[PDB]
Amino acid sequence: YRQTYWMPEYTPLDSDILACFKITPQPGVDREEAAAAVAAESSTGTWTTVWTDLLTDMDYYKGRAYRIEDVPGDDAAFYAFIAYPIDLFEEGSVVNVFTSLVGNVFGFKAVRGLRLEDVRFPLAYVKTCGGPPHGIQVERDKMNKYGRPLLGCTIKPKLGLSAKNYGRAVYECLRGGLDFTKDDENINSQPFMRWRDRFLFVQDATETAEAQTGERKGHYLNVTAPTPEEMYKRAEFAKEIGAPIIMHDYITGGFTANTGLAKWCQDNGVLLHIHRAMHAVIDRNPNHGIHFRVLTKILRLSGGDHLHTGASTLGWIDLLRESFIPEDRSRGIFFDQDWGSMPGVFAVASGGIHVWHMPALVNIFGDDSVLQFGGGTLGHPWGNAAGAAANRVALEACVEARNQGRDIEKEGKEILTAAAQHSPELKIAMETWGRDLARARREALSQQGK
Amino acid sequence: EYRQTYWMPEYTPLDSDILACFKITPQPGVDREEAAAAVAAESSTGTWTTVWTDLLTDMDYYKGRAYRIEDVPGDDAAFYAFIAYPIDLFEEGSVVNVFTSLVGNVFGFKAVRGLRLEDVRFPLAYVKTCGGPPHGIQVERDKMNKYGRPLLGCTIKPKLGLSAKNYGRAVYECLRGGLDFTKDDENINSQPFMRWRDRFLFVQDATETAEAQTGERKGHYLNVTAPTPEEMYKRAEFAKEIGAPIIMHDYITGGFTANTGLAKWCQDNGVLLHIHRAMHAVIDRNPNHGIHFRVLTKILRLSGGDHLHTGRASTLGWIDLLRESFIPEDRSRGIFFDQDWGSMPGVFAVASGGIHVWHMPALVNIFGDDSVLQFGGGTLGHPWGNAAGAAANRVALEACVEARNQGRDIEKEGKEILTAAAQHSPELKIAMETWGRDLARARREALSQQGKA
Amino acid sequence: YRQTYWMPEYTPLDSDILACFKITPQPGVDREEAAAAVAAESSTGTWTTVWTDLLTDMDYYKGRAYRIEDVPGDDAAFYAFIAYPIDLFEEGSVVNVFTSLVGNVFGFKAVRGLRLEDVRFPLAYVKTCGGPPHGIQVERDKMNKYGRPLLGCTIK
Amino acid sequence: YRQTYWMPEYTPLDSDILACFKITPQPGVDREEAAAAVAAESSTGTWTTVWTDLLTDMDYYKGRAYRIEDVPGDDAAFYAFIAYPIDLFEEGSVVNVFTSLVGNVFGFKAVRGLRLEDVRFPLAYVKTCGGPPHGIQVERDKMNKYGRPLLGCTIKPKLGLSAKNYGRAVYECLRGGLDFTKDDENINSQPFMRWRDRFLFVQDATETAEAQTGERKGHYLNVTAPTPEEMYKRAEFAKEIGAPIIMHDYITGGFTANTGLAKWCQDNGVLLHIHRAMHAVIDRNPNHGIHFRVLTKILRLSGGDHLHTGRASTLGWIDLLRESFIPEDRSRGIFFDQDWGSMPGVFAVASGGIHVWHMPALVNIFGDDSVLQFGGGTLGHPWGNAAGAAANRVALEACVEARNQGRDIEKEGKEILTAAAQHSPELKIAMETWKESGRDLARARREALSQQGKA
Amino acid sequence: MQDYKQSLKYETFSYLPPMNAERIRAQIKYAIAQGWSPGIEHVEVKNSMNQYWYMWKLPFFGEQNVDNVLAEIEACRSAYPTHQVKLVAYDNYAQSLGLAFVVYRG
Amino acid sequence: QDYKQSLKYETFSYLPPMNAERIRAQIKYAIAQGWSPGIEHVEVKNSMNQYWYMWKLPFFGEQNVDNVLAEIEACRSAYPTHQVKLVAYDNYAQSLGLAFVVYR
């Protein structure tokens, strides 16, 4: 392997895809044979040479291991940096780039563990992908929502609710002050709630709550389906009935399906909320799998307008949202990632948060985020509308504080208690439970280029 | 806390229930009943909380519930939770929804160190809702006119850099040599150096030319894996438009939605569907955290394919899962539930990956007739060309099958059989120098005379 | 007909389609043989066993009479219970199930009268059919009607 | 019911649909009132006269009993004859005519039994229906077959056979001398033999036997389906692959589907074989139900090119099926003149436990414009499907050559068959194997009306 | 058992031995007795599945004499000794052939 | 060494032609599996046809290897220019457990 595939003097081209693999080799392997093996197994599949290879330019069509680094800690693991000429891949196909990097090497017997940490998508390849159907800024304009994170509520129980009872919980949430409610990942078209009936009553709920609040309202109607035809049919019905946003399970429904849904959403002006169902099967083992920041770049190319994003955390949020993200090893960002004009994707926070988390969530995620309260909304003692108002008051007072200059996370309890003197719903609720870097680069480049 | 609602050791599963077996490695503080219960809740009704909306529903029917706990032989850190799910929790005919429901949330549960889905029991009433293989083994054999032996394939290398016409030339040489199939690699889609439509024209040209010169049906797994469903289907239609018998898909990297749709399209159009399991090792290698390949095997059979790559004990476990009509429980092979497929057809097991003439006796002895044997370098690497390597492998496969049919022990007698055939075959001789169903049939007989008894 | 199609020890599988035929037999035929005939006539309808049968698994692909009962208050008629394996039918086709059960056997001359009383559709076959487009509860929600029977008029 | 619906002086108009109901009345009801009730229940079904009736012309829009007769040899039952104005029905809809006549009245409690015996379809209503997609003479021309009844085999077992094995039986049959093989009525698309695979291998068999014999072959591919979209998809694939003939179960699939399929068959040149599965549920009980001759007429109007016809009544409905005009004939259960005009006739199909020894009586009862379908009588031959087919085909021709020579083929049966075996070893072995004017009237009347018109 | 020998066929009566003058005569008077019009056609062997064979002259409308038809058969066969010869009988009522069979298989 | 192309005939046609001992073994193996031996034949130009002529009928319940081998030679004699194929019907799978050309 090392003869052909370890190329330490190779400086990558701006058009190459680059991959950073954290290799954990067996005790008797030299780091360069392992790095050259991973370059070869993720590009040409072999070490040998048969007569058909000599019909081709073997020097151009191969991945190159071009640098090896230590891992702070695990002295039994090293980072292997690999370059792939842009021509190994079909344009506009996260499916083909993804297949090529991870479709084969991860069974390699010669390593104890393989972990794909990051992938440098060159700007020449980004420009071939459809990207977000709309992206953060177009979505704020469509929904007419500026100055705060958006608020959402995943409806529960995921199971056993009729369409109409389901619509009831949606209506009571949206009228309370939440921007969005959300179908669960597992809600597709089950016997207790067929999709067509759910879509109708949810849309009823959405228009009734919108007319009673004068704020635009959304609900992520989940179109994840058994086949592309069913997926598209469901997306078409949401458009026919006026629904402004739909949802897809991009990993379990799949990249081919999702890339297609994203492009249909842009063709049809339908916002697209993305769920990362099953990411943890893949991204949780720090020694074997694919890191969620790779999964995050895949989705932005493929297409999403929202994405659930759970140090590392704030790295992949930048990757999801900003125009340029500089290399930052302290955040596991191993390469500069340039996105150009490809719009960024709303970062979605979820999982067991309530009013007490509000000051931190506004602090950490910033304005261009969606904050999704499951039980934090429904579990309010006075019902869904009261808990939506509580969450909306808390969010808005944490934002007014931040704007006023205060350390919202330290003055958290104080900010909240003061605004609860104007909102019973909030007070009872308390009792129950990157950009500047990207723009600095644009200005600098506008003045003198390189 | 989950234990009270989701731990039901008194529950006996209905025959219509989906069952799962998780290998749970709990954190040091958590005891087994509570881990099993959390897993069951986080993969069905994803909470311990009772909010008012739950009281609108029958919380007792609409939940997964853990019903049995077991030790893991030789691992005290881990244990098995067996969990039952009412058939009503899932969209019918949608492995996308059963997959999402089972594995789309629970794997991030912080109170567990490692979670691994070992097996899933699909009830007959849910199997009958899924399309299954577009043809399956026996129908494909009829269409292709091949009986009494494993099928033979070769994957074209290099995977990168070949023009459409150069590629078809390696295909032609292989096929005319006696191989039944050739194969696009998983990464072969539509890259700048070989656009997909050009590849399809020249491969099909090679397929027709080799079929004319041999008198045996030929095919080449044309890869329709694509960025979008629209591109996938367009590529599939063109392969039918030109007369190709078989196409190919990367069901995991393209996705379960696209693949179910492709299988449906294939069955509606008479095109065989060869399935590649790319990415699977990301998921099924680590024995403490992920999804075992035998689960990935069952989802493919239900989603639809006519061939699946299958790669000791577990390996032939999931082969039986892939091909046979009924597979009884067997923990010696990692089969944790009886799996009844009914009349849903079996899928060819495909063996590939660094194999040559010398592996033939073991391959025939292990996979049997209803398998495809894929040779990478083992055909391209022959020193007289592709045609001769194809012939060498074809002769060595046939000699093993004739030897097996005759009562010989083809593994114990591997060298002798191949040598005795080497004498009538210069291609094989120099190539030698360079390098279960009984059970399902028994149960069907018994259930025919006695029924339920 | 009897030796192959009367199986009194067979217990129906849960995947089986079951039928209950009330048979009024002609005066000179025994109940065993008439049940087995109705089972054969409503599944294989074989009047002469030929070589193509031997290409198939004949024990599986056949209806089978498995029980007989008296008709209370009628000594001339009896109930024949018959099991059909789920594989005999096209999924999601009442057309095919109907045609199979009742398409041939009601003309059986060797019986004086034949009445199909009940059919057991197994869950695994129910799941293959579309069912009501909506059903009672969905409809009530669509029409916003609760707590009383609905009322209609037929125009004359 | 009587004062408005019993009209003994009404003479039926020629545009009227006429029905003949055999009524077995309950002990305490008179025949007048029971006829008038059946007429009302099968047209206006009024139990209380209300104000909306007075918005309509009540004298026109109603069925009317206009005659009653005794049932010969049955003092308990009588015949009620009823006229329905052509305007009561949707044009070109046997569905609507059927539903109107039989959709309500058979549940009339005041009657002990009700049997619809015959229906007079007036010419002016016949002209609104599509009819057979082709009919006997067109089909004969398309298949280039003349001077003998056609011969078919029904493949058995109905169940368990793979698509390819099923095509093998088909190939062996067709190549030995049958014109047609047939899907069983239960064969749709089951797990052991998906329809698309069945169609492909049957067509392969059809073409191979056709090339090996030089006579056009066919196989009735059954397109009976769960849904109209599936029915039409299956029919389109048979056309796509070159198949000359398809099959429908018109009762169990139903008239709406069958009517649409016959329309599609004419538009696409596909011949259409009609199976009568379920008919014995409706038509076996002589006291309650619908007689098969009605179901014969419904099928001619709805559309089919062959129809299974399975004593005096039997010969009657064959005439109703095949001929251009059929006179009233109570001895053959024909209660009204039926004029079909130019609407083509349909092949009658004889099946059910017949072998070579039935051939003389079959050629003699059915004549040329018929299909003789052998189930086990072809497959059961100790030498295979080809020899069994050849035996049936030799027996068929020799009976036709005998009859064309003037011989009493039914009397001289065992002799014509024996002189035939002296040249066909296959027919001889099969003989040890198993034991033992309608046209002319129609022509006479067309010529009569051609010279004189109304006379 | 005896193996079924396969060979081309030629529709009605072709599964019986070829017809002597006597058997042909009886078919012709059968047709005349039916009121059908006798007709004669011929075609090359390889083309026997053609819808349209060469017509020998014209149909024999109003023909009562079997022998005249039998002679016209002979003359057609003598003009085309390599061709198959067919006898047909037109039925103008049904616009069909009452009867058709190959007299010589060529 | 350059590769010599010629027409082939599916399973076993890459091995040397079978004498009587080898043919019998395949027949015995098929019976040992419980399959029904069968014999088909066809003109050489037509070997790729799905439907060959059936020689007689399949030999159901047949345990005598030597009687199937006789019928092969019987079929060869009746069609000396045809290819002769031995098949073995698997009733459970509705497939063929074995098929190979005995005489080319």
From Swiss-Prot, chain D:
What are the positions of the active site?
A: K156 (proton acceptor), H275 (proton acceptor)
Source taxon at top rank:
Bacteria
Q: Where is this region: Necessary and sufficient to target proteins to carboxysomes, interacts with shell proteins?
A: 1-124
> What Pfam families does the record tag this protein with?
RuBisCO_large (PF00016), RuBisCO_large_N (PF02788)
Documented EC number(s): 4.1.1.39
The UniProt disruption phenotype note reads:
Does not grow in air, grows poorly in air supplemented with 5% CO(2), a high-CO(2) requiring phenotype (hcr), has apolar effect on expression of downstream cbbS. Expresses type II but not type I RuBisCO, does not form carboxysomes but instead smaller, empty cytoplasmic inclusions. A double ccbL-ccbS deletion is hcr and forms empty but otherwise normal appearing carboxysomes. Required for growth in ambient air.
The record's GO molecular-function terms, alphabetically, read: magnesium ion binding; monooxygenase activity; ribulose-bisphosphate carboxylase activity
Gene Ontology cellular-component terms for this entry are: carboxysome
Q: Which cofactor does it need?
A: Mg(2+)
Q: Where are the N6-carboxylysine modifications?
A: K182
* Note on domains (UniProt): The N-terminus (minimally 1-122, fragment 1-136 does not bind any better) interacts with the shell proteins CsoS1A, CsoS1B and CsoS1C. A slightly longer fragment of the N-terminus (residues 1-136) is required for targeting to carboxysomes, and will direct foreign proteins to the carboxysome, with reduced efficiency compared to the whole protein.
State its role. Answer: RuBisCO catalyzes two reactions: the carboxylation of D-ribulose 1,5-bisphosphate, the primary event in carbon dioxide fixation, as well as the oxidative fragmentation of the pentose substrate. Both reactions occur simultaneously and in competition at the same active site. There are estimated to be 270 RuBisCO heterohexadecamers per carboxysome. Alpha-carboxysomes are able to assemble in the absence of RuBisCO, unlike beta-carboxysomes. The RuBisCO large subunit is required for enzyme integration into carboxysomes; replacing it with the carboxysomally targeted gene (Tcr_0838, AC Q31HD9) of H.crungenus places RuBisCO in the carboxysome, while the non-carboxysomal large subunit of H.crungenus (Tcr_0427, AC Q31IK0) is not incorporated in the carboxysome.
Q: What else is known?
A: The basic functional RuBisCO is composed of a large chain homodimer in a 'head-to-tail' conformation. In form I RuBisCO this homodimer is arranged in a barrel-like tetramer with the small subunits forming a tetrameric 'cap' on each end of the 'barrel'.
Q: Which PANTHER family match?
A: RIBULOSE BISPHOSPHATE CARBOXYLASE (PTHR42704), RIBULOSE BISPHOSPHATE CARBOXYLASE LARGE CHAIN (PTHR42704:SF17)
What is this protein's record name? Answer: Ribulose bisphosphate carboxylase large chain
UniProtKB/Swiss-Prot annotation, chain F:
Location within or outside the cell: Carboxysome
The gene name reads cbbS
Q: Which GO terms describe its biological process?
A: reductive pentose-phosphate cycle
Specify where it is mainly localized.
other
This chain belongs to the protein called Ribulose bisphosphate carboxylase small subunit
Give any extra note attached to this record. The basic functional RuBisCO is composed of a large chain homodimer in a 'head-to-tail' conformation. In form I RuBisCO this homodimer is arranged in a barrel-like tetramer with the small subunits forming a tetrameric 'cap' on each end of the 'barrel'.
Q: What happens when the gene is disrupted?
A: A double ccbL-ccbS deletion does not grow in air, grows well with 5% CO(2), a high-CO(2) requiring phenotype (hcr) and forms empty but otherwise normal appearing carboxysomes. Required for growth in ambient air.
Q: What is the recorded function of this protein according to its Swiss-Prot or TrEMBL entry?
A: RuBisCO catalyzes two reactions: the carboxylation of D-ribulose 1,5-bisphosphate, the primary event in carbon dioxide fixation, as well as the oxidative fragmentation of the pentose substrate. Both reactions occur simultaneously and in competition at the same active site. There are estimated to be 270 RuBisCO heterohexadecamers per carboxysome.
- InterPro entries, A to Z: RuBisCO_ssu, RuBisCO_ssu_dom, RuBisCO_ssu_sf
Q: Which PANTHER family match?
A: RIBULOSE BISPHOSPHATE CARBOXYLASE SMALL CHAIN 1, CHLOROPLASTIC
Pfam families xref list: RuBisCO_small
What is the source species? Halothiobacillus neapolitanus (strain ATCC 23641 / c2)
> According to its UniProt record, which protein family does this protein belong to?
Belongs to the RuBisCO small chain family.
Documented applications: Expression of 10 genes for alpha-carboxysome (Cb) proteins (cbbL-cbbS-csoS2-csoS3-csoS4A-csoS4B-csoS1C-csoS1A-csoS1B-csoS1D) in E.coli generates compartments that resemble Cb, contain RuBisCO and have its catalytic activity, showing it is possible to make artificial, functional Cb using these 10 genes. Cargo proteins can be targeted to these organelles. Alpha-carboxysomes are assembled in the complete absence of this enzyme in this bacteria, suggesting carboxysome-based microcompartments can be designed for applications such as custom chemical reactors or delivery vehicles.
